[PDB]
Design a protein around this ligand. Sequence first.
Ligand SMILES: [Cl-]
Ligand SMILES: [Cl-]
Ligand SMILES: [Cl-]
Ligand SMILES: [Cl-]
Ligand SMILES: [Cl-]
Ligand SMILES: [Cl-]
Ligand SMILES: [Cl-]
Ligand SMILES: [Zn+2]
Ligand SMILES: [Zn+2]
Ligand SMILES: [Zn+2]
Length: 227
Amino acid sequence: AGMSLTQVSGPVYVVEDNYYVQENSMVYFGAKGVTVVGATWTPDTARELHKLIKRVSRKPVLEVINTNYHTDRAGGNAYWKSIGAKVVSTRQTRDLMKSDWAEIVAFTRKGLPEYPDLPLVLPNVVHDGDFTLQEGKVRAFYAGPAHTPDGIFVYFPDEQVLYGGCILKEKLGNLSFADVKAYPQTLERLKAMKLPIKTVIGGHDSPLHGPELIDHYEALIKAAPQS
Ligand SMILES: [Cl-]
Ligand SMILES: [Cl-]
Ligand SMILES: [Cl-]
Ligand SMILES: [Cl-]
Ligand SMILES: [Cl-]
Ligand SMILES: [Cl-]
Ligand SMILES: [Cl-]
Ligand SMILES: [Zn+2]
Ligand SMILES: [Zn+2]
Ligand SMILES: [Zn+2]
């Protein structure tokens, strides 16, 4: 299908969004409603995700997290706002989105001319630090710059699942925005947290991995140009 939504553990589901360059995002089905992690590529893809969510739960979509300011993590924002879902990010992500959205949309359209010229839609719930949702069962944190300066991790302690967003994935990918020297330093700060991790969800390529995805990408990035 163009998009799938599949349980990985309990209330934690993975979205494989096959539009444009495949991106993987998360959904958490909570007591009071649904938290989406990664807004997906466009308002149309967001609508496609919402359609899958409505086949699983009647509960409202409470909030959507932009794990960085880029199109693959924030492009759905217009749709999520339109349905009354909060759009959540760190202050850093919101500030970079305000200044650099036009730039990332233009860069997106270089590779994907078919991608729409989306207007800026900023998060409306902004956090100054690390933050949690769903009674502490969805935990977002900053551990330094990697694919972008602002990208955050999201951890689900009950299921021991770590969402890597654009930071963790199978192939090196494009490094145009990346801090290549800091990248492994961020991954090592992450490892030093010693979070219990059974599953890492990569934000591109095939999503389901073990904790060794962190080590896999770390070795890749340490070999890259500008490392
Ligand atoms: Cl329901
Ligand atoms: Cl439910
Ligand atoms: Cl353009
Ligand atoms: Cl990121
Ligand atoms: Cl592998
Ligand atoms: Cl694996
Ligand atoms: Cl791996
Ligand atoms: Zn990006
Ligand atoms: Zn990405
Ligand atoms: Zn793997």
